[PDB]
Amino acid sequence: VLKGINFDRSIVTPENEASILDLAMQNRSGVLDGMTIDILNTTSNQLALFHGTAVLQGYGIEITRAAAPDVLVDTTGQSNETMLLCLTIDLNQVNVPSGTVGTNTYAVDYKQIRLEFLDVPTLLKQYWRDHSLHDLIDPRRVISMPLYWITFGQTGTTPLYEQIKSNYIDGGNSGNPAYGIAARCENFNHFINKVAVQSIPINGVANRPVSSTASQLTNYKVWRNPYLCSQDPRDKFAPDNLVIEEDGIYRIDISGSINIANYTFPASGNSWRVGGRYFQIVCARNSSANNLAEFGAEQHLPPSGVWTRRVLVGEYTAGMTEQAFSSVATISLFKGDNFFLQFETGTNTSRDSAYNNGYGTSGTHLRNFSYTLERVGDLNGTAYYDNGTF
Amino acid sequence: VLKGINFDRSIVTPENEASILDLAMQNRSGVLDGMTIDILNTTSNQLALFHGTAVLQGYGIEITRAAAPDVLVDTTGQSNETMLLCLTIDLNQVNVPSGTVGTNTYAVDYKQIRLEFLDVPTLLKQYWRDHSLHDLIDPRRVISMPLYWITFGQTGTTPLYEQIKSNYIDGGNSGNPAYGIAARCENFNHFINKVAVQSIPINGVANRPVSSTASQLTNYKVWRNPYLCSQDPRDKFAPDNLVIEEDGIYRIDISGSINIANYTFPASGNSWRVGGRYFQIVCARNSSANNLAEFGAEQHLPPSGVWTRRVLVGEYTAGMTEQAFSSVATISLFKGDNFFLQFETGTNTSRDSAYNNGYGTSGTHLRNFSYTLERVGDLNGTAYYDNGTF
Amino acid sequence: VLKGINFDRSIVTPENEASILDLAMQNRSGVLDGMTIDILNTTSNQLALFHGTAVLQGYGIEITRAAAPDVLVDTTGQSNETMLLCLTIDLNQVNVPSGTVGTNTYAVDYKQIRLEFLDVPTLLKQYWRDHSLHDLIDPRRVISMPLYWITFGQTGTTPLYEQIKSNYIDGGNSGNPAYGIAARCENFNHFINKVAVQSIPINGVANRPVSSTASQLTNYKVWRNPYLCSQDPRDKFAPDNLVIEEDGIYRIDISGSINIANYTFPASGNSWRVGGRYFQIVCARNSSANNLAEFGAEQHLPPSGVWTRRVLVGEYTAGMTEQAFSSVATISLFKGDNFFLQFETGTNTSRDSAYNNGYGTSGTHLRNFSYTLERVGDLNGTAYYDNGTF
Ligand SMILES: O=P(O)(O)O[C@H]1O[C@H](CO)[C@@H](O)[C@H](O)[C@H]1O
Ligand SMILES: O=P(O)(O)O[C@H]1O[C@H](CO)[C@@H](O)[C@H](O)[C@H]1O
Numbered sequence A, B, C: 001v002l003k004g005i006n007f008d009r010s011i012v013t014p015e016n017e018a019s020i021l022d023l024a025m026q027n028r029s030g031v032l033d034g035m036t037i038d039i040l041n042t043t044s045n046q047l048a049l050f051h052g053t054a055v056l057q058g059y060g061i062e063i064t065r066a067a068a069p070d071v072l073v074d075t076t077g078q079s080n081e082t083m084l085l086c087l088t089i090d091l092n093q094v095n096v097p098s099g100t101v102g103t104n105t106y107a108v109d110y111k112q113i114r115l116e117f118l119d120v121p122t123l124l125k126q127y128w129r130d131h132s133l134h135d136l137i138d139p140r141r142v143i144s145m146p147l148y149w150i151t152f153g154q155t156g157t158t159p160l161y162e163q164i165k166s167n168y169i170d171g172g173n174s175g176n177p178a179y180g181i182a183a184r185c186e187n188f189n190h191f192i193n194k195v196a197v198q199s200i201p202i203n204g205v206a207n208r209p210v211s212s213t214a215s216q217l218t219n220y221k222v223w224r225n226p227y228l229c230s231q232d233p234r235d236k237f238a239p240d241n242l243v244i245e246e247d248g249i250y251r252i253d254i255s256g257s258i259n260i261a262n263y264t265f266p267a268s269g270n271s272w273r274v275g276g277r278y279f280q281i282v283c284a285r286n287s288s289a290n291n292l293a294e295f296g297a298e299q300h301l302p303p304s305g306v307w308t309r310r311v312l313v314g315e316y317t318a319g320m321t322e323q324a325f326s327s328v329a330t331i332s333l334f335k336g337d338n339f340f341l342q343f344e345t346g347t348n349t350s351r352d353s354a355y356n357n358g359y360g361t362s363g364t365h366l367r368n369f370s371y372t373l374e375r376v377g378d379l380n381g382t383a384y385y386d387n388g389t390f
């Protein structure tokens, strides 16, 4: 039969209002405020956390403030291990009410809510990003959200901690928590190496032309949304590659200019004409390496025939010192993918190359380069096949 | 007087929580999961559908699973007709409760919910996209959502079916169901015909340059959100025109390059200078033809003075073989409109034309062309006049 | 302890469901429909308003319709003043219920809701945009939303009124009320003045080239979202500057072309080569002037090291009559900031200038120029420091 959920004779249940709040949360779970570590009230037997509010699959969880310590987690038995401090909902447990709504004595012991320590494989098997209490095919009764990486030393010491920022809805994403900006940067200048194919460094360090003979590695302002992407964990790829943490249709915006761009000089032999040189800027995705995602989680496999390289700007140098470019594209990206930008041109400086033989400010370089990477759509259901290949 | 809805002494009603869920749904109705046809349990007297969940103007509807068939719809009396299988809310009916919340016997017969067959004019008169239970000026008591086109044959046969995907929130749009991407494509190459004005084919087939003498019609990956737009239903316009299904402020992104671009050769007569040739890429809207929208529904009339053509890229060829371009614009579009892209240049190849006299890969063509069309704003209330004209 | 809000044994409270509706509203408050002035039922002792619905920090407020006047506000004692007509929630008051749910006589006198007149300093001290009932650090018990600027004359006269459109969710923003388009325009042509640095007029009037000798100030279609931005209130800056009303990460899109662009003519002395001329289009922010925001409200101070100028397009003229450009950037903007676009080039027309010595259609000008400014992210919490500087 046809069942009404919100109708005149319907009884609105807890599962119902959680499903509504989850929808309003864009199916994202996370700490809405507070719930950060309290080192002052942290010992070698107890871990303390400040008061706050979180939403886990539509269920509102609160750590209440009083008098501090707002809450205490038992660390006895935990030594010489790296654990995950998790907030867990266990629907197998029973919430115990006491007193009465008539007197002013109603209270509940929420045994369905736990603050605990889990190892990485245990958390992954009950992580909200991968499993759901509300799931259609595999509904679960126990779900968790990791708050902190906790590294316990020898018995009698206080532990080391690292916030799992992907699980905190801190700021930048309020209103559209599952979408918005993934990565963005300020304008930067980067020297073009004398090679056919090279990546453009999008992670905060550029090889900035500083003099007529040299370029030097210089920081530039960059921002990343930890829920959507992260800097590659391997030092070889760290300057260039992003690891995508969330499946979706993303929008990539690029702009800048190619300064000291090479071209064949107009001479009597070529009928006093500029010999333009081909170059292209491409965006790329690579999924050959598994476990790049947070917690070394399993990558999401892309559909058959998925793109790997896409031309954002393809043209010839026009005989000017500096020539501007701009591009905007929507692309499919998968959890675990590597995402990066490449600069492609010929290697013969006297024939097909967009780059010259100069170094530093005398050499061909990218000037005023910037980008924005944003999540603009999901790949749930049919979209995975229809929209996921490009 | 001033009435509080959510206040301490207020009674939260069914209409109230439906209005809240509708707001959380971005005022969009549709199947959230399941509710697809079950051909195995479909006969010549009954139509079967799988279990699922839908939200119709804030009212949650569920088809419950048990033992299949999850639900059965009586098809007796339906023959040699094309009908719409609809999910209807009728607030004139009375939901009948039985048993008690005290025992574990409470049940409701939701007579306010129906699975029925309607003809196209009947559905349109009570379609959720055009009429509302919550409406300010014309509030309705009966509202429907079409799920399937059902074509019944002769008495004793099983019918033919077609899913109304615009009414299924399948994927790509979760989180922002009323907005997001309307249409997008992968990079493609398209030969420029030797005419003054031509449309660029945005519906999946391009006239791809394949040799030095020929171009051939080749498919390219394209995606459309059925709720926002569709391929033109008339074969003459099918390669080029989109039909907009939903009013709004849309964002159009284009990029690519013009390859083998024509120009006046630098000669002694012109002081050894490149004679650039003007061309422009425009986006366009046309509402002359009514009933192009889904179900042949009535178009939404645009305000007085509305734009029809807008220049996205206007410039001269620069003497290079290939020159890249990019553009991003926000435009107003109305339900029933035709939306398309045009390439405009002169017809005299020796004087004003951006195109040459070559064919295939030797002829002027668009290379690496792609676009994204996205809904970024609505045209409700005052916005219709203020923002709707451009 | 860990408290559950939405769990099986939990009691869902009024504050709870208001917090849920506020989240669903993207933390924006405003009139959802109606609540506009009723001049017909307005006297010299009373102000009338039409029926409608508003949401103030998750609390639903309704003015009920019956027989008009839908509601009356006492204006006795108000003379020779400019007041703000405000809708206030005061949680210190007590809502008085009467009758019973058993009979059909339940009614509430919502003393927690008021329609009143406040002076600008009083409203600012209890304005929903700046203070919250739900606030973590400074929770308030009284909060208001301004609906109209009301200017009372001499005793015995009807007042003058001005709608506070920023507090009305009229249209264009339904679905994403706190985000979406801030400002947009149709394509326009603007003459480039013979100076090093000039602003491009983004507020609806351009100096349009009309003849071979003259340009004239001509209107062009422009739209602004009052909640996000406004035209500068000072006449000196009115054609060029926007005042940002809301903190955030914004996206700026620009496109157009530079027509009649200057360049050094190819002559025997320069080896028959085009001497390109540098120019740049920049977007800018300035916060030196306080109180530019609505109600002369205090500006939001940007973090240390914040950007002020950013290059969107930087390149040389290429020897063509017309050369197109496009740019897309994400930038940080603060409540009270001035936002504007500048055109920068050299002043020596025979050496470094992108502009020539012509006027009107014979002079260098921007052609088909348009832009979109959109709010794409917030600057709450950590984002203020991490993302706010660029
Ligand atoms: O090209 P290879 O060695 O297969 O692949 C390597 O470079 C790619 C491109 O940066 C990375 O995405 C891969 O994770 C890495 O294994
Ligand atoms: O130019 P015509 O014949 O008025 O109009 C025709 O072409 C337009 C442009 O493709 C379409 O939008 C119209 O639906 C069609 O009737």
Ligand SMILES: O=P(O)(O)O[C@H]1O[C@H](CO)[C@@H](O)[C@H](O)[C@H]1O
Pocket: C237, C241, C286, C287, C288, C289, C338, C340
């Ligand atoms: O340059 P000045 O005089 O400091 O600053 C003036 O021009 C700026 C740029 O238009 C405005 O933002 C300022 O509000 C105004 O005071």
